[PDB]
Amino acid sequence: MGSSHHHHHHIEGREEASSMERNFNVEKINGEWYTIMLATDKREKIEEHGSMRVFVEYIHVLENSLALKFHIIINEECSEIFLVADKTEKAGEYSVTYDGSNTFTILKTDYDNYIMIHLINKKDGETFQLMELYGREPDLSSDIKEKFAQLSEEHGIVRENIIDLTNANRCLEARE
């Protein structure tokens, strides 16, 4: 008998480093987005049989506000909702009407990673914490889940509530 041999090679593509958010620009976010994962202290509200699992399909920037378009599962079919968030006395915080009172703020969002949005809703004298994450693509790195999840703890949100909507209603076929 005899014996054979072989070899192996490496992979190139050394990524580069980035600087601080000095090149900030609204034009970057201005356009469209995609749903990555849904989190909230009330997982029952974002359930499959709930009505609080609405997600935006595209984000628009106005002169003195920001337009948005969310959808909702109605009769086993996607929907189309339109709303506008007007700026408040304080910059960064935006208020919009939707089934009552709603107000979000930009705490952390990168055009190279993803955009986080802390939305708080109130109803029946009961208010819960809601979170929304969007990325350039419908699927982000597995590490991103834990990266954005870190902020979830801030609102007392446990990973137990953080579930990937990838294997759930996407409705990405309705949007355009």
From Swiss-Prot:
InterPro entries: Calycin, Lipocalin, Lipocalin_CS, Lipocln_cytosolic_FA-bd_dom, Maj_urinary. Its main location: secreted. Transmembrane segments: none annotated. It comes from the Eukaryota. It is found in: Secreted. Coiled coil: none annotated. One of its GO terms (molecular function) is small molecule binding. GO terms for biological process: olfactory learning; positive regulation of neural precursor cell proliferation; positive regulation of neurogenesis; vocalization behavior. Detected in urine of males but absent from female urine (at protein level). Male pheromone which stimulates female sexual attraction to male urinary scent and promotes a strong learned attraction to the airborne urinary odor of an individual male. Promotes spatial learning by rapidly conditioning preference for its remembered location among females and competitor males so that animals prefer to spend time in the site even when scent is absent. In addition to promoting a rapid attraction response, also elicits ultrasonic vocalizations and urinary scent marking in females which do not occur immediately after exposure. Belongs to the calycin superfamily. Lipocalin family. This is Major urinary protein 20.
